[PDB]
Amino acid sequence: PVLEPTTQKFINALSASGGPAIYTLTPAEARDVLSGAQSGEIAKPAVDITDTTFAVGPTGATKVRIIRPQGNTDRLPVIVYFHGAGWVMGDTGTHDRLVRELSVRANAALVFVDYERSPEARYPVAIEQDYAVTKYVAEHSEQLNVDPTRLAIAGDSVGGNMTAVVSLLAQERGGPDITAQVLFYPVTDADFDNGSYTEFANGPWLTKPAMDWFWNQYLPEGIDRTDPKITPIHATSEQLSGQAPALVITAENDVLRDEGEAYARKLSQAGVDVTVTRYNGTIHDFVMLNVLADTPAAKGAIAQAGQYLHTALHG
């Protein structure tokens, strides 16, 4: 694959580091790898941060980080954010710069759902936590000082899986109302033999054996993976129709590319207004990784998402 030069340099750095493959590690080891990779010094938007817990979801409690453009005490539209990193990894640290950018560019409060990770928690704990926080935000707008009629959901990778599943759950349960949804390179299927899985089975960055491992951490052995709450590519027209306008951003060189774009087609053919954009020359995780933060694809996609959300939440 022809990668943007800085992105190629990163990939070269990686294969020259000779590390062990992420899926040979323990969950705690894998968490620390990504946390350390994202611990470098890098400029970030100025925000006010409140870490707390909402007494909602199937475990009885869900940890959340609430972010707002620094010094802004107005009643703001709100983004509920579901982070990625394979269900196993990711935290408020790994995704900090990305979600700050979304909060400030959208001029919105952002509620980061620090959901229970896998394999300690399997399907469906996280998606139900995610749904419960989204409902909580919609129902406690005075307590959060947000406008619940301008509520967006967004996520990256497995977090894009959660975005689509929260949209589906909200359709089935009659709410809450969602203004717009943003999905960065979402996981939507478990077909490890499709076009982009084949083309990028060995990378860069994300591999087919890693996806196999991640799915196995997320799901109990033997469950039917075609359920749309697991692989939303299988959602019916009636489950997709009526959902909020969506922005789907894919990476050209990513095993997940084809399923993300196929899901966007399914949404569009159900009558949903879908903005779908492939960024050439970049890789999986390109709006999260600090090392790619100055590449044209990262800058362009974060700017596109931020402007999409600002228009949705303030237009």
Ligand X SMILES: O=[N+]([O-])c1ccc(O)cc1
Residues β-bridged to residue 109 = 78
Based on the shown chain and the rule CB under 8 A, indicate whether residue 199 belongs to the binding site for a second copy.
no
- Ranges within 228-247 binding a second copy (CB under 8 A): 245, 247
Site track for ligand X across 205-224, x = CB under 6 A: xx---x--------------
Out of ligand X, a second copy, none, which partner does residue 22 contact, by CB within 5 to 8 A per kind? ligand X
Site track for ligand X across 147-186, x = CB under 6 A: ----------------------------------------
**Near ligand X by CB under 6 A: residue from 4, 10, 34, 196:** 34
Peptide bond between residue 186 and the one before it cis (omega within 30 degrees of 0): no
In three-state secondary structure terms, 90 is: coil
Based on the shown chain and the rule CB under 8 A, indicate whether residue 2 belongs to the binding site for a second copy.
yes
Residues β-bridged to residue 148 = none
In three-state secondary structure terms, 269 is: helix
Calculate ∠ Cα 97-180-48, nearest 5°. Answer: 35
* Cα end-to-end distance, the chain, whole Å: 39
Based on the shown chain and the rule CB under 8 A, indicate whether residue 299 belongs to the binding site for a second copy.
yes
Based on the shown chain and the rule CB under 8 A, indicate whether residue 149 belongs to the binding site for a second copy.
no
Q: Segment near a second copy (CB under 8 A), from 14-22, 53-61, 212-220, 298-306?
A: 298-306
In three-state secondary structure terms, 283 is: strand
Q: Tokens representing 84?
A: 């990625």
Of 61, 76, 149, nearest in space to 113 by CA: 61
Give whichever of 108 and 274 is closer to a second copy, judged by the CB atom: 274
Q: Exactly one of 157, 167, 258, 285 is catalytic; which is it?
A: 157
User: Which residues are tagged catalytic?
Assistant: 157, 254, 284
